[PDB]
Amino acid sequence: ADSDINIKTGTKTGDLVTYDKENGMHKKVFYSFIDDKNHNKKLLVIRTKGTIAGQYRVYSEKSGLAWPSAFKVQLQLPDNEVAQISDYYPRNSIDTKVQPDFKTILESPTDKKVGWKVIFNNMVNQNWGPYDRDSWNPVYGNQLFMKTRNGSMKAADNFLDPNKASSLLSSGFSPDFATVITMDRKASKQQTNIDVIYERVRDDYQLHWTSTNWKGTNTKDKWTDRSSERYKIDWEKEEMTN
Amino acid sequence: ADSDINIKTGTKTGDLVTYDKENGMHKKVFYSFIDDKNHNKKLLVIRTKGTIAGQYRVYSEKSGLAWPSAFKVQLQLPDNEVAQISDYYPRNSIDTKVQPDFKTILESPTDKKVGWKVIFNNMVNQNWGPYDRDSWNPVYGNQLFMKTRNGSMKAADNFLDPNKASSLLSSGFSPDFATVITMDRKASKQQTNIDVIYERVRDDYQLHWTSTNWKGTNTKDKWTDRSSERYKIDWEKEEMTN
Amino acid sequence: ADSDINIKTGTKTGDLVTYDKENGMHKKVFYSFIDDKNHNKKLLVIRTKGTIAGQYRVYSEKSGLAWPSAFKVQLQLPDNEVAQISDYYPRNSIDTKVQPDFKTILESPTDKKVGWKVIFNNMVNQNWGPYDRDSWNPVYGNQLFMKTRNGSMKAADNFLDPNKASSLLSSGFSPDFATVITMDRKASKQQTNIDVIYERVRDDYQLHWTSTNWKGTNTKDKWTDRSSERYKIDWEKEEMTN
Amino acid sequence: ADSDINIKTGTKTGDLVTYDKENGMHKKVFYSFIDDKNHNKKLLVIRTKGTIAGQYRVYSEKSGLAWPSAFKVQLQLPDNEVAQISDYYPRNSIDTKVQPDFKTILESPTDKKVGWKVIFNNMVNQNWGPYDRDSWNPVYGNQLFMKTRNGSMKAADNFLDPNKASSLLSSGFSPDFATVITMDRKASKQQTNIDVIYERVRDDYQLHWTSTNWKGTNTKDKWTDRSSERYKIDWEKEEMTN
Amino acid sequence: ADSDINIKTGTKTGDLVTYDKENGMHKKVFYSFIDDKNHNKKLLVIRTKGTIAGQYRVYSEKSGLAWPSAFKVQLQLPDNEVAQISDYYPRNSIDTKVQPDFKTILESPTDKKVGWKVIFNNMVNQNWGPYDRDSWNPVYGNQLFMKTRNGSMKAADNFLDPNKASSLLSSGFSPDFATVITMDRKASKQQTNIDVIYERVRDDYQLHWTSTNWKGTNTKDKWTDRSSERYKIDWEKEEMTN
Amino acid sequence: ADSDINIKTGTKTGDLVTYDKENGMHKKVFYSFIDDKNHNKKLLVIRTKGTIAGQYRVYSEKSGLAWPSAFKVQLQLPDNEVAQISDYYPRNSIDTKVQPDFKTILESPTDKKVGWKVIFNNMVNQNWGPYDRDSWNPVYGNQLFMKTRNGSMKAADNFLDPNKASSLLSSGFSPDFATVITMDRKASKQQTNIDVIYERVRDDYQLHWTSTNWKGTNTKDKWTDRSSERYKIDWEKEEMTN
Amino acid sequence: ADSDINIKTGTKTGDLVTYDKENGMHKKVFYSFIDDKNHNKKLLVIRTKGTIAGQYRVYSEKSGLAWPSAFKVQLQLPDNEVAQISDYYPRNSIDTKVQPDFKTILESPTDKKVGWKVIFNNMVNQNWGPYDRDSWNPVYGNQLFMKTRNGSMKAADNFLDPNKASSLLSSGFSPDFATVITMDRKASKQQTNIDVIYERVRDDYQLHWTSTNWKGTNTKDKWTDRSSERYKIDWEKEEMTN
């Protein structure tokens, strides 16, 4: 810190939004242009705010339930242009020594690519061992959504209550993430292009009655809504658009 | 966070009231603006403050118990208007790892409807287990309001006192929630419209005696005092008026 | 919250006193007017402060023991006037997971009625057991005020000292509560009445010695020294009178 | 609170001193005013900071052992005067769930009389449990001041070291409390009087020897070296005068 | 603590980026100055955010597994220049008594070089023993990467899930460390140089089946992506441009 | 807590040192003055920081070990003067029940005398029990300064490590304590005098080889190295000097 | 704090560096002169910053292992000069009852000698037991760098890896301490010298071999490569030249 190293104190906005219907995945960005001209480059923080609904839906009617395996959100840009990607508040941090049920990873961010993976880490239901996005339990398969042990009603009805499950699976997950874009200032022309994906890595989960002690089977990333969204970031005017 | 990105740091109010005599629900909102020449557009903030009384009463002479299963508030709007919905604090925070008695949810918010279900999760009754909203037991059924085990007086007098139960069941739960909606600044037209379907998802607790041990039963959604009170937002005047 | 919403801005005073000799009812209403032109209303913060004396005493000698069952403050208001009860702290907060002795509840309120009940939710006597008011331990009835199990003097001189008991019951409880009232500013007539009833639920306790191993009973709600009061709110004069 | 009610804000000194020889206790007060056009009335603060030397002394040579049972500070005023006691900190607060060894209560304060008794709730001697002023060990009586169990010298020397005992007993307790008194400013007459009490309610613990296994005996509140000191505060001149 | 020393408290930016396609590690620095007539000289802060992808990737197809072991970002300057390294953070600090997975260290810093090592103190796999970077389980070898202690598919498929491992093994680790230098002001000559050797000392892990239980083998420092980068800090013009 | 009482808030320096060569006594005082147009009298602060050598040393070799039984500090003034002693930050605060090695005390401060007792409440030797200023371990005497169970060399060398023992013991202790003097401003006379004592109440601890294990004996308070310094304070010119 | 004494908190710069080759000690100082005429004298505070390398180096091939036994950095001035030593942030604080590995005590100080010894009070090797600077075991001797309880490779190769040992041993320790000096203002002559004697108390750890369990030995303070330094503190010009 500044005091820790004897440093004394060295050290215009807008709120875009959109939404996808067939997929069902909300979107938003909040940008800032504090206009201190004394800084080298224009700084822009892309708050990935939105709502990727849980889509915790029983599509198959045996009965299959589609659930969110990954709210992967990532910013990618073409090669020809001149800008670069610099920073991101959500960072893979040294896991010191709790096991949170969703692990906010950041894909290995190669220059011009920063991608978070809001993964479904080990989650506890009905007071037993937990299970993650790739939860595959030799007895209950993906043991995400078994309402009880000894159910008696219809299989399609006999799904873990969306209320009892982790609140992200039922409603969805709102990303609280940020990353930034930078380059030298004095270049003649400034513009980039982005490719957002809000990949709700959909995960088909066929729940079926096999015999006596219930059993689960799951298929990883069986579907997906790589709802590839493109934003149009207008850096000169200090506005962000699509 | 803000320091983690090494940024220097840089990125009119009123009130309302109304009550329902039949259903007994108090409703309020509060707003605030800034005249920020740097910010893009106008922002209005909706606080859901109010009092959805539990009406924890023995209406029917087991007892039928009109208790609030899940107060729910939804700020829903017609499609035709040009508005859009942005932020919904509180969000479903990553279930991080505590079992709160009312686990608030942000039901899967489409771009147009965002609605919490501040549901009734576990409640400890007379030094025993969780007993969530849909708490339902083979023998004792739901277990919200079991005054005691070995009662001896009239059953109508044998219902858990509101004082000992969760303080929300007795006297309701004041919603402490908020959200905001957005739109471009340079649009000619302004008008919007709200729904605010205040809900009190009533539910029943029937303690029926077997002659060997008490039981319970739950008639979920036996009523719903969903006193839908659509609100009116007066945006240009920088006022909110019902 | 406000940062989670990304906004940086959060979205004339006095005092009074009065006493009652018969029942010792002190009242204090330190108040505030914000002289804010950005606000379209007036606030009257009601510091619910006073001396609701414990009156822990052996009123009659066996010897009956009067003590505070439930301190309450009900800021009741006449209906004809146009005022309305907007907000209030404390609130019935979501139970989370501690069992405090005095459970500050907010009785089922309405536009006109807001009632706290500062109920007695337990105490430990001689380092054994959480004994509350609604606690009826037929072996000891309400276990509030027994100094020791094996007394040997006159019964009247064997009741729990005002010191060892929970300091609230005997020395008295001081309320720390508030509730706000609001109404539109453009009202033609500026005046509304009020009726705040300070009410302590004194509880009879005919503590008597039963000759085998001490056994008590607790007759609830014998005496209730309900004390009213009025404050005239002169909004036109920007003051509150009486 | 204030923010919880959705509001931002809205709401000349002296250092007296005095002491007494025979009783041996130190005394002092502090105050402060304000000048607000917005506020109505006038406020004042009285802090009872001082030093009441516990007199942990072997008064008689068994050897009679004087010690401070009940430190107290109590402010009382004549009736005919027009003033009233408004506020006071600390307050008898709600027990939650620790047993502090020197408890502080606020005896039932009439509008005129307010008093604390900073009670000796316990102390641990050689790590064998808690014992208050009204401690009565059936074998060690009030077992505040036994140095050990197996002494061998003159009994006048086998008394607890002030060092090991609670730091208040050895050298007294300094009150850190305060009260408040208020009145309307537009009064023709502006005078009152006070009666402080620094009643170091001592307690004879004449500690003898019973010749089988040391046995302790106490006589509660034998004397009181209650200075009963009477103060007079120079209210009118915006000062306090000795 | 300035208060502990008894004294009342008392006492231009930019950014860059560059990427390597073969090795693939992002780089970054951020600086600050004050025009302080109280400080004798200027200061720099060299933040080393960057990003070093882990390359937790199967190199040999048994099947080899390249992965990052220690991100030893170090900074060093030519001897001839008048520069000398003054301060740095983090500092090797006293370890009280937690074993954080990555034990960041500052290599023995001579006055010319200050080099941090981001080693893996220990990582936890499938809820059993911890496993350091230079961990060597004589049977399970290094233990950073084992999808299961009992697998059945192709060996290349049976390597630890990158998501399950520490979020720094799979997606790499971006250091948050910094250091500074401080040169006299009166000097006639004002330039220096730097060499920053970003490091990814990629270590191998091999699970070679022994026919009785899985057995692991590792080759310390089998490679290194010593990007061996070389920066050119433009000290003179109150920038860091290159 | 003035905020707890509903009010907003509870609304020339130097230094000296002089050394005692024989006793190794380092002594300091710090002061602060303010010209407040609101306070009634004058203010000053006396902070006895100083520093007291340990004197862990074999002055004579059982073997004598003159360790600091009691760092003590006590300002004292002549009787005739008009001054009085009022305030002091360190206090015999309620031991809110946890056994510090040095429990600092404030000896019963008369109006004239305020005296602290920085005493040895305990410390641990080779991972065993606590032992205080009067640690009278009938086995090891003062169990403070005893090396080990079975030292075999010349026991003039077998003495507890001055490093392992509590750091206050060998390397000395520095008081961090303060007190204050108060008087009216209207008096014609402006004088005061002091009588400091820094009695590092020395001790003697001497192990004793009785038969097989070790036995100890300590001649408490054998030397009181009373560095009885007679400080002088020049109040009128707002300076302390002597 | 100041509030407890009832007070409203009424209480040119530069930097250096240098280094040595053979022993490898990096030394410097940060200082601040407050430009306030208010303080009686000139304020100068010395921070002992720098890195005294570990020299955790196997010089001889057991293995003679010279390690930092204590970074006993001192500070002393010529007697003839007139200045005095007063204050220092890191004290031998009351060890206020956890035992850390390094304890940075402050030697018994004087008006001329004030020196810490950052000793190796403890450390944990491979999770079997504690081991200190005086770590000696009749078998394992010291246990700073016993890599294992058994190794099959060459002893010069068999010695704890620097990474696993406490980060201070391998790389080195950087003092973060400070110290103060004092002298009156009115003095005619205005200069003084200083003798900063940095230090690295080297110490040897050797692992002897008994052929059943390895043995260890330690040679105390074989080297004390006590580098020296005599800062030329130019107080008047407000610079610590060198």
CB atoms within 10 A of CB A202: 21
> 3-state SS string over chain B?
CCHHHCCCCCCCECECCEECCCCCEEECCECCCCCCCCECCCCEEEECCEEECCCCEEEECCCEEEEEEEEEEECCCCCCCCCEEEECCCCCCCCCCCCCCCCEEEECCCCCCCEEEEECCCCCCCCCCCCCCCCCCCCCCCCCCCCCCCCCCCHHHCCCCCCCCCHHHHHCECCCCEEEEECCCCCCCCCCCCCCECEEEEEEEECCECCCCECCEEEECCCCCCCECCCCEECCCCEECC
Residue A48's CB: how many other CB atoms inside 10 A?
24
Sign of CA dihedral C234, C237, C239, D2: positive
F49 CB neighbours in chain E (<8 A) are: 6
Q: How far apart, in whole angstroms, are the C-alpha atoms of residue B113 and residue C63?
A: 64
Cα end-to-end distance, chain G, whole Å: 38
Q: B228, exposed or middle or buried, with CB in 10 Å at 0-12, 13-18, 19+? A: exposed
Distance between CA C202 and CA C145 in Å, rounded?
14
Local structure of D169: helix, strand or coil: helix
| DSSP 3-state of A168 | helix
Q: Phi and psi (nearest 5°) for A3?
A: -65, -40
Contacts of D1 in chain B (CB under 8 A): none
Distances C200 to C30, C197, C222, E164 between C-alpha atoms, Å: 21, 10, 11, 59
Give the count of beta carbons closer than 10 Å to the beta carbon of residue B33: 15
- CA-CA distance, B15 to B35, in Å (whole number)? 20
DSSP conformation letters of D97-144: ----SS-EEEE---SS-EEEEEE-----SSSS----TT--BTTTBS-S
Please give the angle made by the CA atoms of D54, D58 and D60, to the nearest 5 degrees: 130
Chain E residue whose CA is closest to G120? E94
- The torsion angles phi and psi of B4, rounded to 5 degrees, stand at -60, -25
> Would you give the distance in Å from CA A141 to the centre of its chain?
24
Spatial separation of the C-alpha atoms in residues B184 and B84, rounded to whole Å: 9
Rounded Cα–Cα distance for residues G70 and G54 (Å): 10
**Inter-chain touch B101–C95, beta carbons under 8 Å:** yes
In three-state form (DSSP H/G/I as H, E/B as E, the rest C), the secondary structure along B111-173 is: CCCCEEEEECCCCCCCCCCCCCCCCCCCCCCCCCCCCCCCCCCCHHHCCCCCCCCCHHHHHCE
Helices (H), G138-211: 167-170
Neighbours of A45 (CB within 10 A): 21
Closest CA to A160 of A202, A131, A118: A131
CB atoms within 10 A of CB A134: 18
Q: Are B55 and B162 in contact (CB under 8 A)?
A: no
Phi, psi for residue E186 in degrees, rounded to 5: -75, -5
Nearest residue in A to E130, CA atom: A97
Single-letter residue type at F199: E
> What are the DSSP E strand ranges found in chain E?
25-26, 46-47, 51-52, 66-67, 74-76, 85-89, 104-106, 113-118, 123-124, 130-131, 178-181, 195-197, 203-207, 216-219
Distance between CA D69 and CA D134 in Å, rounded?
8
List chain C residues with CB under 8 Å of B49.
Answer: 87
Chains that touch D (3 or more CB pairs under 8 A): B, C, F, G
Q: Is C145 exposed, middle or buried (0-12, 13-18, 19+ CB in 10 A)?
A: buried
Pairing of strands C232-234, C239-241: antiparallel
The whole-angstrom distance between E156's CA and the closest CA on chain G is: 31
Residue of G4, G6, G7 best to disrupt the D interface, most CBs of D under 10 A: G6
A-B Cβ pairs (cutoff 8 Å, strict): 121
**d(Cα E153, Cα E166) in Å, to the nearest integer?**
23
Main-chain phi, psi angles of C48, to 5 degrees: -75, 85
- Chain E's closest residue to B6, CA to CA, is E30
Report CB contact under 8 Å: G105, F167. Answer: yes
Q: List the structure tokens of D49.
A: 């900071």
The structure tokens 């042990």 sit at: A149
Q: Among candidates F55, F45, F74, which has minimal Cα distance to F229?
A: F74
A214: nearest Cα among A125, A162, A152 = A152
SS3 E174: coil
Q: Are B84 and B181 in contact (CB under 8 A)?
A: yes
How many Å apart are CA C109 and CA D95, to the nearest integer?
26
A163 φ/ψ angles, rounded to the nearest 5 degrees:
-70, -45
- Measured between CA atoms, how close is C110 to chain A, in angstroms? 30
Residue of E nearest to G1 (CA): E3
Do the beta carbons of residue C102 and residue C168 sit within 8 Å?
Answer: yes
Backbone CA torsion sign across A93, A95, A98, A101: positive
Nearest-Cα distance to chain G for E37, in Å, is 8
> Which pairing describes strands B44-47 and B25-27: parallel, antiparallel, or unpaired?
unpaired
Hey, what's the torsion of the CAs at A130, A132, A134, A135, to 10 degrees? 20
Give the 3-state secondary structure of residue A169: helix
B32 to chain D: which residues are within 8 Å by CB? none
Rounded to whole angstroms, what are the CA distances from F206 to F56, F136, F200, F214?
12, 12, 19, 10
Report phi then psi at G170, rounded to 5: -70, -65
- CA dist G199 and G74 (Å) reads 8
* First CA to last CA distance, chain D: 39
CA–centroid distance for C87 within its chain: 18
- Name chain F contacts of C49, Cβ cutoff 8 Å: 6
Please give the C-alpha separations between residue F8 and each of C176, C228, D12, in angstroms, as whole numbers: 17, 30, 16
C98: helix, strand or coil: coil
C-alpha F47 chain-centroid distance: 12
**G1-242 falls under which CATH superfamily?**
Leukocidin/porin MspA (2.70.240.10)
Gaps in chain F (C–N > 2.5 Å) come after which residues? 11, 61, 97
Q: Do A111 and E18 touch (CB under 8 A)?
A: yes
Q: Which of C6, C10, C111 sits opposite B19 (nearest CB)?
A: C111
Rounded distance between C-alpha atoms, residue G205 and residue G125, angstroms: 14
The CA–CA distances, whole Å, from D178 to A214, C57, D92, D181 equal: 67, 27, 13, 10
Q: Nearest C-alpha of chain G: how many angstroms from A39?
A: 27
Q: Are the C-beta atoms of A134 and A105 separated by less than 8 Å?
A: no
Residue in F196, A3, F16, F89 with CA at minimum distance from that of residue G180: F16
Q: What are the structure tokens assigned to F238, written together? A: 């707002």
Helices (H) and strands (E) in chain A, counts: 1, 17
In sign, the C-alpha dihedral spanning C238, D1, D4, D7 is: positive
For chain A, the domains span 1-242
Resolution in Å, one decimal, please.
2.9
Is residue E205 a contact partner of residue E185, using CB atoms and an 8 Å limit? Answer: no
Q: Record the tokens describing residue G200, joined without a space.
A: 């690295």
- As a whole number of angstroms, the distance between CA E229 and CA E213 comes to 43
**What residues contact residue D81 under an 8 Å CB cut-off, 6+ apart?**
D191, D192, D193
CB pairs under 8 A between C and D: 120
**What burial class does residue G24 get, using C-beta atoms within 10 Å of its C-beta: 0-12 exposed, 13-18 middle, 19+ buried?**
buried
Report residue B203 as tokens: 């539910």
Largest CA distance in chain D: 74
Cα distance between residue A196 and residue A43, in whole Å: 19
**Which residue, G176, G172, G48, is CA-closest to G120?**
G172
Distance (Å, whole) CA G227 – CA C53: 73
Provide the 3-class DSSP secondary structure of residue C222. Answer: coil
Q: Name the minimum distance, in Å, from the CA of A4 to any CA of chain G.
A: 9
Query: From CA G174, how far away is CA A55, in angstroms rounded?
Result: 55
Identify any residues that bridge with E180 across adjacent strands, giving them in sequence order.
E87
Smallest Cα–Cα separation from F160: which of F120, F128, F205?
Answer: F205
Which H/E stretch holds residue A170?
helix A167-170
Q: CA D84, CA D96: separation in Å to the nearest integer?
A: 31
Whether omega for the bond prior to residue E90 falls within 30 degrees of 0, making it cis, is yes
C-alpha triplet E139, E142, E147: angle, nearest 5°: 90
- DSSP labels, C64-81: EEEEEEEEEEEEE--SSS
For residues C81 and C230, is the Cβ–Cβ distance under 8 A?
A: no
What is the separation, in whole angstroms, between the first and last Cα of chain F? 39
Elucidated via: cryo-EM
Q: Which residue of G has its CA nearest to A4?
A: G176
Distance CA D104, CA D123 (A): 15
At B5, phi and psi to the nearest 5? -95, 0
The single-letter code of the amino acid at E86 is S
* C213-227 b/e (C-beta count within 10 Å ≥ 16 → b): ebebbbeeebeebeb
Laid out side by side, the sheet with G84-85 consists of G45-48, G177-182, G84-85
Instruction: Please state, in angstroms and rounded to a whole number, the distance separating the CA atoms of residues D161 and B102.
Output: 54
Q: Which helix (H) or strand (E) holds G104?
A: strand G103-106
| Rg of chain F over all Cα atoms, to the nearest angstrom | 22
Taking any CB pair shorter than 8 Å as contact, residues of chain F touching chain E are 15, 30, 47, 49
Q: How far apart are CA A121 and CA E166, in angstroms?
A: 12
